[PDB]
């Protein structure tokens, strides 16, 4: 389900740029240092859309990767090929699942889940 969320957000993120009429000027909505001194309005709802979709995509990706880190550790152990290993292993970041790693992991997952529920609404 979370993979579906990431891929659906990836699909839906194209439309704000595609429908834009001048699609290569999408960066204007984002605050960015420019010689003009111009700013986004921040009172329209498309400026809010830029912050909501971008925050939603990044938070979903980090939460999904944090969940995958223990799974990557099982895959690297069962990979059975030296090159297949070290690809899951770098993603695993030497997980070495242990107490004092699980305790922080469980608390972080609860906090990320708590932050995500207001975010998606």
């Amino acid at each position: 389900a979370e993979a579906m969320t990431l891929f659906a957000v990836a699909c839906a993120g194209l439309y704000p740029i595609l429908h834009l009429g001048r699609p290569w000027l999408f960066y204007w909505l984002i605050p960015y240092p420019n010689t003009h001194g111009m700013w986004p309005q921040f009172r329209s709802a498309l400026a809010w859309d830029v912050f909501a979709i971008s925050t939603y995509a990044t938070v979903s990706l980090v939460f999904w990767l944090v969940g995958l880190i223990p799974d990557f550790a099982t895959l690297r152990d069962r990979a059975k090929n030296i090159w297949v290993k070290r690809l899951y292993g770098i993603a695993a970041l030497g997980w070495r699942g242990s107490a004092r790693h699980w305790h922080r992991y469980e608390m972080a997952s609860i906090l990320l889940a708590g932050l995500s529920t207001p975010l998606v609404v």
Partner: protein
């Protein structure tokens, strides 16, 4: 890579003496629509014409201009204008033509010029008339033979029946409290249109102080702009108008004939007659050019009985050179061509093969003539079949003279040397007179010098008028016996056909022009197409459409149901009907016109050209072949069978009624005199139960108390739906012309639009309402709040600012605009590959690219120029005042309007005209329930109904 290309700059080698670089100049010139000159002031950005305006000192063009004069800029820059002399379609030289012409004329000197024939249009230029008279003196047997499709033959025929002499009738609408129009469009483009429109509008404009308003009664076959601005309108059949005029004379007691008529027509006759005799010397009767000569003779007789002559109607010596029956002269020429008597035919414009009636068969008879020479300014259908085609200089690039309907003798001044060369009509006449290589400037100057003098010539160029020349007032004698002893033909022979000049294309000369073809036609809103116009009842009976047509009739209680039925009655628009008139079948698609007369069809001339330029190359169906010489404006019998095969017709509005909403406010004059705010006090009682709506806003806005504030007031009573303002905006703001397919997809780009609401009881005889809509410059603007990149933000003055460079193209602003006045460049509409179109674009306004929104900018370029000029003057004086005059800034739409409905000025300055108009009791803003607080406001329409017809 670098920010931009080298952008080389090329300067002059010798500076023009009177020119300051970057400062536009204005020059006075004359533009003729029917051969009658209208004075115009044209802006020359850098020696190239770019914007046509009106000449305040020219009679018939006091600031106001018609759409045809406005759209002449794009005509002068058409990429399809003739560039070289063609012998038989092969390029040639002017010198070779001069040699051939000389040889042909010396070969015709054995006879007295019996073969040499001419064929011009209505010529009013004194220089050309004098040269033609001299040529006729040199060749005794030559003939002039004027002709043009839209002519005034019936007017001169009626004059020669009533007075036994050609006179020029002028109407002073300022002193006429009652005006009656017998199938006459005086508010539609024609001779004296701007002057008549301004005088009529001034009387209609009503304030709290005003105690008197003019009343218009119009009887017509097809609803028109004159019909829209009428307190009472009767849709009589076109043939029946002559009988109606005879009945009106009989009840007044002047010579005429009693005619059987419908009860509604009889009630209209009683009201007109009763209003007359109560306004003797305060009334005028106007008869349309289309109407037969007897109607004109009766109109002169009625005016004489009421004593109106010398007060509202004035007679002058004829201003159109030699007045003549043009259709009869063309019939004489075609018979001579069939006989083979003619050996040489020279035609100055007029597109005779396409313009001439189908029965004449001019093209077949043109082949018999050994040599035919045409000066057209374009390679027209006649030029294609004519030897020795010669390019004609456009009026903007040519030296010339013209006379107005009153008689003015204004001088045409070239703003640019001819782009593709070409010869003026006077230069062609000179070569015939035996002087080749004669400059146009010398020919016109030599005639004018010694008549007005060298000093007069200098004053005439500086102003737009020649003070010395005017038509002398004459008193003609009315022949009672001749007018009384006339047939007065009775109406009724089956379905009738009415031929009317197209509102945007005229006679089809302007078919190539993109702006006019893209312009929505007033009262039908069609674009790029010609359709047969019929009443809903006429369509049901003739085409067998399955609708009752009595469902539309009803009271206010079922009004919403009847409006829905009219939408269902629509969607039958575009069905092709095969119409047989006199051996000719048109196969034209049909568009339903609610106000049209029953058993009548209107067909517009100017469509179906085959040799026109790439724009309008093959648009619409030609009506010229069915048209006949004996009955040019009327038809007796039409089969009108239905062939199905529906063809798409594109209209901009797509809705014909207001759905029970307060968009247009209409009130009586008598109630208005008692209380100006009565219209506003009402409506709010029905909607909220209280006289005043207590609108509340959560948003502060800006004070604007001590700064210039820009606002516009549009008067509904004054507007006639001419559409001149839409053309003026397109020229001034470089708006693009989208194709018919883009208009079909509803992507037309127009900053100003006029809406016809057709809202009335019955709906078979509805009251047309025309309202001009442009950005309201709302102090609190919804479009600005929804813009993510801040492309749309407000201004210190109060103007909404749309920055094309900032716009990223989201399109959210158009969705949140209540009036939907914002237009988006979905595709690259602007033309980048055409050099002539690039010259036409105004430098002050940017040419938008694809992906940017556009909206009315209150002509910001004019406001910015005035602000810079006021600041510069203040600093030089040392005052630091920065004061801008009330008349300093005029928007292009405001200058273009002939009526004067649009007023633009500071709102804060209480002495400005806009401030005084906005203090009127009937001023209001559209959609007040939305707290937008618009600056563009409207004045509610006030009518003047007669108690006879109304009560």
């Amino acid at each position: 890579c670098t920010y931009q290309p080298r952008q080389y700059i090329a300067p002059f080698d010798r500076q023009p003496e009177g020119r300051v670089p970057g400062i536009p100049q204005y020059f006075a010139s004359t533009l003729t629509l029917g051969g009658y000159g209208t004075g115009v002031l044209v802006r020359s950005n850098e020696g190239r014409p770019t914007k046509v305006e009106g000449n305040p000192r020219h009679p018939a063009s006091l600031g106001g201009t018609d759409l045809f004069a406005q759209a002449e800029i794009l005509t002068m820059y058409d990429p399809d204008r003739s560039t070289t002399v063609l012998r038989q379609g092969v390029p040639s030289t002017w010198a070779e033509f001069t040699t051939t012409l000389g040889n042909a004329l010396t070969a015709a000197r054995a006879t007295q010029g019996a073969g040499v024939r001419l064929l011009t249009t209505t010529i009013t230029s004194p220089s050309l008339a004098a040269q033609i008279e001299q040529f006729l003196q040199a060749y005794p047997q030559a003939r002039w033979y004027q002709y043009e499709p839209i002519n005034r033959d019936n007017v001169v025929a009626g004059a020669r029946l009533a007075f036994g002499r050609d006179v020029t009738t002028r109407y002073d609408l300022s002193a006429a409290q009652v005006v009656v129009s017998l199938d006459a469009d005086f508010l539609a483009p024609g001779p004296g249109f701007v002057a008549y429109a301004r005088a009529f509008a001034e009387r209609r404009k009503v304030r709290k102080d005003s105690t008197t308003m003019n009343r218009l009664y119009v009887v017509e076959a097809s609803p028109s702009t004159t019909g829209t601005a009428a307190d009472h309108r009767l849709p009589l059949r076109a043939d029946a108008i002559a009988a109606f005029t005879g009945a009106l004379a009989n009840e007044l007691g002047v010579g005429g004939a009693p005619a059987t008529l419908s009860p509604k027509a009889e009630e209209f006759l009683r009201a007109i007659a009763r209003d007359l005799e109560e306004h003797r010397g305060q009334s005028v009767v106007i008869a349309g050019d289309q109407q037969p000569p007897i109607v004109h003779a009766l109109a002169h007789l009625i005016n004489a009985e009421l004593g109106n002559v010398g007060q509202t109607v004035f007679y002058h010596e004829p201003v159109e050179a030699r007045p003549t029956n043009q259709t009869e002269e063309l019939v004489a020429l075609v018979s001579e061509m069939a006989a083979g008597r003619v050996e040489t035919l020279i035609m100055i414009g007029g597109n005779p093969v396409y313009n001439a009636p189908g029965d004449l068969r001019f093209a077949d008879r043109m082949a018999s003539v050994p040599l035919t020479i045409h000066l057209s300014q374009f390679v027209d259908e006649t030029s294609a079949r004519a030897t020795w085609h010669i390019p004609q200089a456009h009026p903007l690039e040519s030296w010339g003279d013209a006379r107005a309907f009153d008689g003015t003798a204004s001088i045409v001044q070239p703003l640019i040397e001819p782009l593709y060369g070409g010869k003026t009509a006077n230069e062609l006449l000179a070569a015939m007179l035996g002087q080749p290589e004669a400059e146009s400037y010398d020919l016109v100057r030599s005639f004018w010098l010694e008549q007005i003098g060298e000093t007069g010539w200098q004053v005439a160029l500086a102003n737009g008028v020649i003070a010395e020349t005017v038509a002398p007032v004459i008193e003609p004698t009315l022949n009672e016996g001749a007018i009384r002893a006339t047939p007065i033909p009775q109406p009724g022979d089956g379905v009738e056909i009415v031929f009317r000049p197209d509102p945007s294309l005229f006679d089809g000369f302007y078919a190539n022009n993109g702006w006019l073809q893209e312009l929505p036609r007033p009262l039908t809103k069609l674009v790029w197409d010609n359709a047969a116009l019929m009443s809903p009842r006429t369509a049901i009976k003739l085409l067998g459409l399955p609708f009752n047509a009595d469902r539309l009739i009803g009271t206010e209680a079922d009004d919403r149901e009847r409006q829905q039925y009219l939408e269902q009655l629509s969607k039958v628009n575009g069905t092709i009907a095969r119409i047989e008139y006199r051996g000719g079948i048109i196969e034209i698609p049909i568009w339903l016109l609610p106000g049209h007369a029953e058993d009548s069809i209107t067909l517009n001339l100017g469509y179906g050209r085959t040799h026109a330029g790439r724009v309008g190359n093959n648009v619409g169906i030609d009506v010229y072949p069915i048209r006949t010489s004996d009955s040019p404006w009327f038809g007796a019998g039409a089969r009108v069978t239905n062939t199905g095969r529906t063809y798409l017709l594109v209209s901009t509005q797509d809705h014909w009624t207001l759905e029970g909403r307060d968009i247009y406010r209409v009130g009586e004059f008598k109630k208005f005199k008692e209380d100006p705010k009565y219209i506003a006090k009402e409506v709010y009682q029905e909607e909220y139960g209280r006289e005043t709506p207590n609108y509340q806003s959560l948003q502060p806005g800006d004070d604007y108390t001590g700064r210039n504030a820009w606002g516009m007031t549009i008067n509904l009573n004054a507007c006639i739906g001419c559409n001149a303002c839409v053309v003026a905006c397109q020229a001034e703001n470089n708006i693009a012309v989208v194709g018919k397919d883009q208009v079909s997809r509803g992507r037309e780009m127009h900053w100003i639009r006029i809406d016809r609401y057709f809202a009335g009881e019955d709906l078979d005889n509805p009251s047309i309402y025309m309202m001009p809509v442009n950005c309201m410059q709302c102090e609190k603007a919804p479009c600005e709040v929804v813009c993510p990149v801040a492309a749309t933000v407000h201004d210190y003055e109060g103007l909404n600012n749309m920055v094309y460079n900032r716009c990223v193209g989201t399109k959210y602003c158009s969705n949140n605009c209540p009036y939907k006045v914002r237009r988006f460049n979905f595709l690259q509409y602007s033309d980048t590959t055409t050099e002539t179109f690039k010259l036409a674009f105004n430098p002050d306004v940017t040419v938008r690219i694809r992906g940017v929104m556009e909206k009315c900018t209150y002509c910001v370029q004019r406001i910015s120029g005035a602000r810079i000029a006021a600041k510069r003057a203040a600093v030089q004086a040392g005052q630091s005042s920065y004061v801008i005059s009330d008349g300093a800034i005029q928007t292009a739409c405001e200058q273009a309007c002939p009526t004067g409905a649009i007023v633009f000025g500071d709102i804060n300055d209480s002495n400005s005209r806009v401030a005084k108009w906005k203090a009127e009791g009937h001023n209001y803003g559209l959609l007040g329930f939305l707290n937008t607080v618009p600056r563009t406001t409207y004045l509610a329409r006030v009518r003047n109904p007669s108690e006879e017809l109304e009560k």
